[PDB]
Design a binder for this molecule. Sequence first.
Ligand SMILES: Nc1ncnc2c1ncn2[C@@H]1O[C@H](COP(=O)(O)OP(=O)(O)O)[C@@H](O)[C@H]1O
Ligand SMILES: Nc1ncnc2c1ncn2[C@@H]1O[C@H](COP(=O)(O)OP(=O)(O)O)[C@@H](O)[C@H]1O
Ligand SMILES: Nc1ncnc2c1ncn2[C@@H]1O[C@H](COP(=O)(O)OP(=O)(O)O)[C@@H](O)[C@H]1O
Ligand code: BEF
Ligand code: BEF
Ligand code: BEF
Ligand SMILES: [Mg+2]
Ligand SMILES: [Mg+2]
Ligand SMILES: [Zn+2]
Ligand SMILES: [Zn+2]
Ligand SMILES: [Zn+2]
Ligand SMILES: [Zn+2]
Lengths: 366, 373, 366, 337, 369
Amino acid sequence: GPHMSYQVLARKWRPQTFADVVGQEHVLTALANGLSLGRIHHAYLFSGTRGVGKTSIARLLAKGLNCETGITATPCGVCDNCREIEQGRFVDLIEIDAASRTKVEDTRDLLDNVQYAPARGRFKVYLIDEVHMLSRHSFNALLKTLEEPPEHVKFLLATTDPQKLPVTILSRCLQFHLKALDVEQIRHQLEHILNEEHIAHEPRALQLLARAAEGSLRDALSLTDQAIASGDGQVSTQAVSAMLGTLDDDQALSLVEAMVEANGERVMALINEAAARGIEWEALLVEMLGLLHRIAMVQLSPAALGNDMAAIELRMRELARTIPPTDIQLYYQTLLIGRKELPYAPDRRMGVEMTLLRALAFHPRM
Amino acid sequence: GPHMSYQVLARKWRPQTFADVVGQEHVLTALANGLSLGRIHHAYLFSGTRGVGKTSIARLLAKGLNCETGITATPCGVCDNCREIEQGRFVDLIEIDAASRTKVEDTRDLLDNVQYAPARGRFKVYLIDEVHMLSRHSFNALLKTLEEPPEHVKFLLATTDPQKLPVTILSRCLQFHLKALDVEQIRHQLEHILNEEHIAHEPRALQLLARAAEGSLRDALSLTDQAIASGDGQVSTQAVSAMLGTLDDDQALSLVEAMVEANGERVMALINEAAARGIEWEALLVEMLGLLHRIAMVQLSPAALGNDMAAIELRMRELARTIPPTDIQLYYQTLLIGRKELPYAPDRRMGVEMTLLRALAFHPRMPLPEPEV
Amino acid sequence: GPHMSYQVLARKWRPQTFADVVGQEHVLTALANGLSLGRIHHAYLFSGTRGVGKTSIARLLAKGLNCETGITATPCGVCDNCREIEQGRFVDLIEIDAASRTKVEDTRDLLDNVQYAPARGRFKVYLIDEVHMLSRHSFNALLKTLEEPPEHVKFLLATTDPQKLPVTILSRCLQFHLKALDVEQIRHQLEHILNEEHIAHEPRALQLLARAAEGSLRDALSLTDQAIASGDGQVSTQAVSAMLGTLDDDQALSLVEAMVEANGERVMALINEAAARGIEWEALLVEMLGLLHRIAMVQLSPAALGNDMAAIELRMRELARTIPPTDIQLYYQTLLIGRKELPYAPDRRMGVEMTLLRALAFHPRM
Amino acid sequence: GPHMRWYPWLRPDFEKLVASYQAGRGHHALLIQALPGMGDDALIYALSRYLLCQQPQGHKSCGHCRGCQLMQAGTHPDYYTLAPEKGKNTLGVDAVREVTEKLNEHARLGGAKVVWVTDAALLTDAAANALLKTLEEPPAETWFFLATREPERLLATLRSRCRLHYLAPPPEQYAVTWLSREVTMSQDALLAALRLSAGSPGAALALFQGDNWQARETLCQALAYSVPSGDWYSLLAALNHEQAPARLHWLATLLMDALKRHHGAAQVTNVDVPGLVAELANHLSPSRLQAILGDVCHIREQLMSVTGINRELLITDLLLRIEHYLQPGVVLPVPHL
Amino acid sequence: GPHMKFTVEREHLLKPLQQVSGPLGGRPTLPILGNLLLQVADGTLSLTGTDLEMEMVARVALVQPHEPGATTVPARKFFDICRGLPEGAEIAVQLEGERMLVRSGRSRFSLSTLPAADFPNLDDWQSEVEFTLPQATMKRLIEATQFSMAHQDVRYYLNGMLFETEGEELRTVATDGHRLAVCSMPIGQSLPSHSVIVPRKGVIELMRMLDGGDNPLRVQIGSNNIRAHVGDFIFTSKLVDGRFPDYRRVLPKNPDKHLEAGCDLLKQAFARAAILSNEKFRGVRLYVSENQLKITANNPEQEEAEEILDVTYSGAEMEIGFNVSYVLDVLNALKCENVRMMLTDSVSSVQIEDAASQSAAYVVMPMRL
DNA sequence: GCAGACACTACGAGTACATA
DNA sequence: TTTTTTTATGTACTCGTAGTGTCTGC
Ligand SMILES: Nc1ncnc2c1ncn2[C@@H]1O[C@H](COP(=O)(O)OP(=O)(O)O)[C@@H](O)[C@H]1O
Ligand SMILES: Nc1ncnc2c1ncn2[C@@H]1O[C@H](COP(=O)(O)OP(=O)(O)O)[C@@H](O)[C@H]1O
Ligand SMILES: Nc1ncnc2c1ncn2[C@@H]1O[C@H](COP(=O)(O)OP(=O)(O)O)[C@@H](O)[C@H]1O
Ligand code: BEF
Ligand code: BEF
Ligand code: BEF
Ligand SMILES: [Mg+2]
Ligand SMILES: [Mg+2]
Ligand SMILES: [Zn+2]
Ligand SMILES: [Zn+2]
Ligand SMILES: [Zn+2]
Ligand SMILES: [Zn+2]
């Protein structure tokens, strides 16, 4: 049994070689140059937003550090050490789920055993995951070890929130900022993996997944698995559109034109109709934000408009022809605040109603 | 140079002589004069921000007090005690990681063995690092020992936030606050280190590293190591600028100039250029806010620009000569609100663009005209 | 060790007769009258501010009680036991650091040593330092011993925090509370030691040392030793001022002084000095808000100033009397808004500086 | 007592979800975005019944194997539940840590393992972080189930590692038909309850079953008394209870409908009570109505979020501030960016 | 029908009942958890106690004609109701509704019960491997490597023993990343190759269960749990899901430097040197020269200890520093006459084994200061 | 032995304090 | 003349109990 439970894409498609890593070119180049030149450090801190790949990058660094080929920038992936660390049975590599072993007793017990020799590999790599969840005493216990560790031990911290670490911990480590993946990178990676697994898909669906993933490969991959489960083995545009939440109709522009006209009757009728269609309120607010942004953008510079969708942008030119920029700016700010406070509402529909009523109250007479 | 296995820039270049410290003059002079005059207090606490030299200065004092020759402020590099303490595992110095010995059951064991005579040297130097981590009972145990210690025991207390110490502990010992380093000192130290290691460097990259170090030398030196890694073993302006994830002003100065001139087309063009470079959009707002804050600095007082911004100084002054303070207040507030609202924007580029649009549209001197009526 | 100057002023200048303790007349006279007139209690508990003389006065009581020339306030200092108490150790004076012996397994042995007759002196004297750290069971044992104390033993407990002691221990102990030394007494003493130590000095430096002492004479002596260190065996005004400026931590109060004074350069210099020390900026804003709230409360009523802010009482009183309430409310509003906007700033330093610049724009100088 | 009360609107989804597990390609972590009391617990329970069954058939458990018997009895070595401790509305990190440490050992019955959290929105930050990695890469044959009011309310890191299933509430006509079958009361009140429960039939049914309907009627009467006179303080007698957030939400919905009536919206959340909403619309100006609505919802959010807050002080201050807002010539709050 | 006729004698069950009780109901985790199951089968009464992790069953022989079935009762109540009866007692247990009535002469007591369907229990399962182990063999196997278990370490797979069966050999491997112990013994039975990771608690409970060479032990290992039958007692503990590391790649491959010495002399010397060793860093530095072993140690107080041993050494002069506790433990476990040590490099691990028998092996990983 | 005695070490509980 | 306190997690400390190593006259 080759770990059947790995059928989940997020567990099967994690890279095993530096070349397999998508994006993050700066940190990859820095790691490769450090390994090749011999400029090896003892405390790496990969910090970035969630689902970007710092755990996988750290595991690849550990693979490169503990390979029998030597201190190589590209792990072989077939040596005994590489196979063992893939299996997770490698003694010399210690993965600490710091969000669970956050107590200081465990940290002190671990640090009292740093002097001993590694079993097989050259280095005794410490993969401390979710460092920010350690207790303050646990942080302060790490200072002396991180400053001057023995030559056979290396700490590979990996946090999703670097600012919560004490400055004394950030000071001893090489901070690698894992840049959030762009839309194109996510789309290309999703296409590559789906074509590898022979799964039906449409480029538009992949574009929607990449845009709605909010700059994360793990989010995009989880959404892809959700779409696969929903659509019976195919990533179809209609299924992923109904799943993620899309506005194929022009009800967003109608809502904007009703609100900017201070037509509460039309605004509430459109809200009722959209709710009757099971609209996703957050995606709706995002669409209004985009429409208002394009309206202001074309108000500043003529043309340079929603030429992509000519139909609505004509009426958008009318809107930009009438509405003063200050009203557009305040409408956008109020919609954004409503999106921010949408979770803090008894109901999403009620939150959208709050946002639109606040927008109406600015110019209720006109 | 030798650079045996390149044993980290931070660890390799630790100070070894009182003339090698990068300029904590207010504590260096006091320690040298106390050692010269024989006024060797039995307890003193080093405090200050991260990576300034508290532990290094403590090791230097142990060097000076354990030297085979007379007690001097200039320890020799040939002395057996000095060599041992440089390599560690010294007989007299007792490295005590207080964070690993917070429990009073260990401080009592420490106190039980204080009276035994040192094997070598003169003063059994107790170097307690991260003193603020000790438990309350540990501090109270340390109290009477610090008040009247044995004549051959010196206490070397170091921490980062002395205010967490009990006040009587602060009373029993001297206090040395190590100020954060200035930018020029950091730059000179980085130049020295890179020259001694024979690595190509440029003035702008080193100035950027010093600015990003935020006054702590260990941060500067780790950042220099990471920049060496980022380049092909060479420190350059492009490499450091890419690594720090920021733009070298200028571009942001053009951004703010197009903002204050109500040149929305130029604002959009520069945003497109930044997108082509692919810089962090929050970095754009942060740098623009920083430049507006520096212009406010210049507005308050003319002597508010350092050499770091000298490359644009003549330009920057002209900004403070034309923008009324209330207009810069409005600009800073609008950009700050935009940064507040950026994470909830439909897209980060969308949020930055809308922030710039709001900043230029609310411009009092050149507002965006109402379209028709 | 080498050369007599190694003796720390906090140790060498330990008072040896009741005429040497300074500023504690309300306890010295009571002890002298009790010893002379025969009035005596089972136990005497000392308390007060750090470095005021509790342990020194307790040692003086131990000297006085155990001199063969009669129980008297003033010991001769010539005979065997008077010197043995100070130089070397005296058998019948039992000095116990309660912090080192908190567990009941040591106080049990101590009270097993109370039934034995004293060797040299008439009164078996116990001096227990830091009695507020004994364990609860140790406190029970000590109370059991104090319930029926033999006539040949008298206890002496010295502590800094009297509130932690059991009420049943306070009930049987005649507590002597020592007030913090006045600035004039500290200055006169420092001048006395400096003149008698052949150390040059200047009166303004002595006044600065006394003010910075915070009332504890040990703090004054330590700062004196550091001032001698900072320089060449000379207490110069410039060296003392520089050292205090290096060690000063009242950035917030001097900063609000400069802000209300509308001195922008002073505010910027103070921000620079706070940055040099690595002062937490959010903590600085919180402390400033607290100071503004307290000064407003002072304006409402002079009773708002308690003993907690005796060090900065005069400055806050004078800055309350000279400043109208409206400026206080405007500054509080500006600083609160600035703290609200501080996290969303390019960095904490520029954010707090920008808040201060916003505050300075109100009612500026020519 | 309350148990696996299966609901018809779960039928299309359940048959789907089990399919994702029938092929063996299902995600180990399934976060259910379902409104409270709508049926997420029953669906998760049935899914776990299918998963832990040694000899299952089709889309239901056999009910004969020892796993089914142990599951029915409420004790099972391979069925862990993470629920708030009795008397405390939070899920400590200690329970999550104990469960995660137990997951290391094999399943006792030789089958799979199930870890079901009753409500992921009640996770403490420490507990959710302790569950992060366990969610990411669980051992062989390990299944996680999470339920939430709002997925975005969860931690931004935990929600990333989970396939998210959304349970769509039934259309309003279907829901009103179902509740009319379940409860024999007026159509207006039933529709008002469904709209109050955000369209979730289960929450409206629970509202009618409990005393919450009587409390809502009393609050409506108190509002009717207080609107013309401004005696909003009396509302405290109806507002202060262990279920204060629900009554604050009812007041917020009433203000919603008053603003709608001023704007003339065709449909309203409170259709059963037209007199009170008309009185609120005519007596109170929309400008002050918006401020009162915002303050009421802010107080509701504060009361829900921070645990240990005192209901008496918050509700009393809200009522006093509302009364102050009623008086003319008083500045009104503005939403903060 | 409520038959449940239990007819047993008290003294023949008090020791089994105390055995199966063990960690009896004291945990309020589950009401059913704090209970013991009585079952009748094969002419014997099975007493089952389980806390969802460890299961213990006593098979006590019956006396009189019985009535098959099963029901669970409060464990503490049953333990206390038969521990005070004078000497022997004719325990007659009967079912009445949801009640057990226990009678013996003029002594009638009641215990409210629960049906056996609710009690979690393991039925028959296909064993992956089966062992017929002499008690001495397993006792030596566990004893010589029990000290090498990881005590609550981050690596969860190290929290126990690896029972690896290969051919007609059974091996136990225990390590924590600093020490390692391997003990292999023959069985004379063709057994399929398999690997088992039994947790710390399971092996400790198993170790304090077997005694007396008169009752051979029967071990049944499946894919999810391990069961041990000692006489009439049955123990069951779940397995660890992890994968134990390849120990044959942990032992040094080319131990060029050979040392042989007396076990007693080495043990005495190491204890003597450890007298003055560091309190929490009990590590000695050992120099090997031609037929000479110099062991040295010190403390922060600098109370150095030094001793010289006359050994049979083959190799070059060498320095290596290792902790004393692991080596004292290995030497104590190796109740032998000659200890053979294998050394490769001043940075490599040290092997320790019996010089007169190739049945055990130990690895000590040195200290790199 | 040996088991008691004694030594010693670990765990729990009850209490106190810190932090956000 | 009887009335008032928020949580969740962690870190020490001090004490009795509780279980076990070991070893000395028993
Ligand atoms: N740079 C990358 N290259 C390839 N896959 C990636 C990358 N980053 C993330 N992934 C995908 O995301 C999944 C989780 O990645 P992970 O490294 O755990 O992110 P994190 O930094 O948030 O812990 C991986 O299994 C892999 O499929
Ligand atoms: N004043 C200084 N002079 C020279 N190097 C310094 C100085 N301060 C810090 N460093 C560098 O930082 C490294 C560690 O400094 P350290 O003294 O540990 O800072 P900390 O005060 O945080 O413990 C040193 O090895 C040295 O290279
Ligand atoms: N009233 C005083 N008179 C003279 N010296 C004092 C006085 N108070 C404190 N000191 C100085 O401080 C040193 C320590 O004083 P001590 O009485 O131990 O303070 P504490 O109250 O904290 O125990 C003494 O040696 C003495 O030099
Ligand atoms: F989610 Be990752 F470990 F930052
Ligand atoms: F990093 Be230092 F010792 F504060
Ligand atoms: F400094 Be005192 F003896 F508390
Ligand atoms: Mg990770
Ligand atoms: Mg240090
Ligand atoms: Zn390899
Ligand atoms: Zn020297
Ligand atoms: Zn005398
Ligand atoms: Zn079944």
